[PDB]
Amino acid sequence: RIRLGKVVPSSIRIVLDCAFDDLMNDKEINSLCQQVTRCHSANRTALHPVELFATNFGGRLKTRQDFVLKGQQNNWKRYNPTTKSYLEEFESQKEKLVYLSADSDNTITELDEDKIYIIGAIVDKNRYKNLCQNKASEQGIKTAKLPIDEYIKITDRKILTVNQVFEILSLWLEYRDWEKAFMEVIP
Numbered sequence: 001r002i003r004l005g006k007v008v009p010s011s012i013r014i015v016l017d018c019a020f021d022d023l024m025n026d027k028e029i030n031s032l033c034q035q036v037t038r039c040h041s042a043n044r045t046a047l048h049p050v051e052l053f054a055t056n057f058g059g060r061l062k063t064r065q066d067f068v069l070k071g072q073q074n075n076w077k078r079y080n081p082t083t084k085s086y087l088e089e090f091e092s093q094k095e096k097l098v099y100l101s102a103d104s105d106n107t108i109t110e111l112d113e114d115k116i117y118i119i120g121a122i123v124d125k126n127r128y129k130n131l132c133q134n135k136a137s138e139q140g141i142k143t144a145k146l147p148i149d150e151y152i153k154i155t156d157r158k159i160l161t162v163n164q165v166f167e168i169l170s171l172w173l174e175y176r177d178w179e180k181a182f183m184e185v186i187p
C-alpha cells in the first residue's frame with residue numbers, strides 16, 4: 001500500500017471501550033491485546049491519525065500488554081489509556097459519543113470531526129449479541145452499525161474484529177469511500 005499526500009491529523013476521537021475484561025478467557029485477552037496493537041499501527045501510518053483512547057483500561061488486558069510490549073506502549077503517540085470509563089472521560093462531551101455496534105438500528109454513513117466513536121474492546125465471536133447496543137442504549141448514547149451489507153451478504157458474518165472496524169474507520173478518513181475501505185481491510 002502507498003499512502004498519498006501529506007499527513008493531516010483528524011479531530012475525531014476513537015475510544016476502545018475496555019470494560020469487558022471479565023467476559024473473556026485468556027486466549028481472548030491475548031487476541032484482543034494484539035488487536036489493540038494493530039489499531040495503533042493503523043493509526044501511526046494513517047493519512048488522518050485520530051486521537052485514540054482506551055477506557056476502563058486495566059486488568060488482564062493491561063498486564064498482557066506490558067508483558068508483550070515491555071513498556072513500548074508508553075512511547076505511543078495519540079494514544080490515551082485510562083482507568084476512567086468513556087462516560088467519566090467525556091462527561092462534558094456526552095452528546096458526541098457514538099457507540100459502534102452491529103446490532104444498531106442506525107447506520108453510520110459519514111464520520112464527523114466533532115464526534116467520538118466507541119469500539120467495544122471485546123473478542124466474543126459475537127457470543128454476547130446486543131452487549132454493546134444495550135450498554136449504550138441504557139446510558140442514553142447513540143449507536144450505529146457500519147454500512148457493510150452492500151458489501152457482505154450471507155449472512156451474520158457482518159460482525160468484525162476491533163482492529164478491522166478501526167482500520168475501516170481510518171481508511172474512510174483517507175478514501176471517504178466505504179467500499180474501498182472494506183476492500184482493503186476485508187479482501
Ligand SMILES: Nc1ncnc2c1ncn2[C@@H]1O[C@H](CSCC[C@H](N)C(=O)O)[C@@H](O)[C@H]1O
Nearest residue numbers: 100101102119120128131132145146159160
Ligand atoms: N458491523 C459492525 N458495525 C459497527 N460496529 C461493529 C461491527 N462489527 C463489530 N463492531 C464493533 O467492534 C466490536 C467488537 S465485535 C464484538 C461484538 C459484541 N458481541 C457486541 O455486542 O458488540 C463491537 O463492540 C462493535 O463496536
